[PDB]
Design a protein around this ligand. Structure first.
Ligand SMILES: *[PH](O)(CCCCCC)OC
Ligand SMILES: *[PH](O)(CCCCCC)OC
Ligand SMILES: *[PH](O)(CCCCCC)OC
Ligand SMILES: *[PH](O)(CCCCCC)OC
Lengths: 315, 315
């Protein structure tokens, strides 16, 4: 079943609930964001040193998109293979700060540059604003690669949860528009299907950090009521054609409601003849990739994602 | 579709055939071994420098088992996480020399020690002698880890084709005997099922480096007449229980008859709750992992296998 480290964390969370700490799904979105963002920052392992961290912004579709560039230790080349990273948080919470230690570790272990994107969040900017920012961040960095110290031939996208969905959708959007898309996609327990409930979405509705109530709280902020749940920006698993999508790494957690649709996305990539790495981390929960203060499996997952991307890019 | 580099290699093969070269499947096994072993040595990328190479032998079940240890560049620790590697060659051909460059690259990229095993070959030593040697090599190195500069907590087995089968069977054998098994299994396009012909075994019977005629020539040498093809040492895919097997990396090639049964083995591991990485390299052939003079994809596969094992072992 669950690893000891995982049970330890679920026990702490259960102790906070009995200790009267409110459910996330009972608060206003902006209030929940402030509280959970601090816990996410605190829940990361200590930030490793990198060669260089850069902060800036560029003109997005409807706002300034902030970015943070992480230059890996021991790499001297001007133009580096580069991962454009989209943080998770149901398109409502998270930011560059909540995923900073993780991006630092990914940069160092991959010997690739990481560029973390601060995309617009719901409920202030509902669907499709977050994905529009994700797409615009990829296009801007692609077209201005030298500005970002990026090798345009080795531009990856990736993220965790909503960020994973974003990375999958960025690849499909570029493919569908007939433009140059990412060289690589790193999908960490992505949400790939909003149209159906998989066996895993039912089985893990409760008891496993990310609960159905949490997904509904995110959903009510992000998605207008009238929206077709088969829209490929909500449900990229439903794409008719997976050919011409870039080589992928797809990671699931065993006790994650998103596991089945994560693995189905990998299956569609494999059947389409896309170079695809699929890994399942049994005995851990959704979020473990960034909860690395509590879950050592997350540091292992960080290193596996980094190592596979690094190997694809010949770093 | 086949990758250009793969078509280039199939062209060279076709140029040798119409001309001086005869079919491998037309020669006595010991004479075919000499010719194909030289092509395998010649087909590897130039050997990268490692920190140290050690040659020795120990008493196996029925003979001396030769080994070669590769110490990775830049690792100082006395006891290293260690991959025990079993070369491919249908249990008939290959040796330490045919997989030397690949083992050097795996050692350097993983920051793990590699110990390549020179197990007994058919037809001189038919089934089950090659697997007996594989099992005895793992047990000897496990029980004498400090003698091999190996951290007993981080002992992996792996191999390509027959070597992949060997690594899978070593893990099952240790699990079934109730002894300490490997910490990790690296299965490079393993043969996992001799009992049935998958869609891929039919589809790729010819046109792609190992033809069905090659598999029959190997089979004639390795398996005594009237052997049970459901024996778990020939057909580890048919194991009833995959629980308690070590964390795995499973790699298939797209145009490989072994692809489907390789992927099925990964599926059994995932369903049993084993931490499992599956990767498919589309557009390449069986053997590409060691044909790295001709196939860049092989060097990418080398680095992916190494990086995933390295990440599991926290190197
Ligand atoms: P992730 O970003 C999971 C929520 C999925 C978004 C629904 C569209 O939270 C850790
Ligand atoms: P979710 O299922 C996450 C909380 C973990 C509690 C462990 C039983 O909310 C009820
Ligand atoms: P590999 O070792 C081929 C697998 C056949 C195993 C059964 C004899 O190299 C072509
Ligand atoms: P097999 O299919 C090996 C493929 C070699 C390519 C050109 C001879 O032999 C028919």
């Amino acid at each position: 079943m669950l690893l000891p480290e995982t049970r330890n964390l679920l026990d702490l969370m259960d102790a906070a609930t009995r200790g009267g700490r409110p459910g996330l799904d009972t608060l206003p979105h902006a209030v929940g964001r402030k509280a959970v963002d601090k816990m996410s920052e605190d829940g990361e392992a200590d930030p490793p040193e990198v060669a260089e961290v850069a902060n800036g912004g560029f003109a997005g579709p409807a706002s300034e998109i902030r970015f943070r560039r992480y230059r890996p230790l021991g790499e001297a080349a001007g133009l580096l293979p580069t991962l454009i990273y989209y943080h998770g948080g149901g398109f409502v919470i998270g930011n560059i700060e909540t995923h900073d230690s993780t991006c630092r570790r990914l940069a160092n272990k991959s010997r690739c540059q990481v560029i973390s994107i601060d995309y617009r969040l719901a409920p202030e900017h509902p669907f499709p604003a977050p994905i529009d920012d994700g797409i615009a961040a990829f296009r801007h960095i692609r077209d201005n690669a030298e500005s970002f110290g990026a090798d345009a031939a080795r531009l990856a996208v990736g993220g965790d949860s909503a960020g994973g969905a974003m990375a999958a959708v960025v690849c499909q959007a570029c493919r569908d528009a007939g433009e140059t898309g990412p060289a690589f996609q790193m999908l960490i327990y992505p949400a790939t299907d909003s149209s159906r409930e998989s066996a895993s979405r039912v089985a893990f509705a409760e008891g496993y950090f990310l609960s159905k109530a949490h997904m509904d709280w995110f959903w009510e902020a992000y998605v207008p009521e009238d929206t077709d749940l088969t829209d490929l920006r909500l449900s990229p698993l439903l794409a008719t054609d997976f050919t011409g999508l870039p080589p992928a790494f797809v990671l699931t957690a065993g006790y994650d409601p998103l596991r089945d649709e994560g693995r189905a996305y990998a299956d569609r990539l494999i059947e389409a003849g896309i170079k695809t790495t699929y890994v399942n981390y049994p005995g851990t929960i959704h979020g473990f990739f960034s909860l690395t203060r509590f879950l050592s499996q997350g540091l292992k997952a960080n290193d596996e994602a980094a190592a596979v991307m690094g190997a694809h890019f010949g770093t």
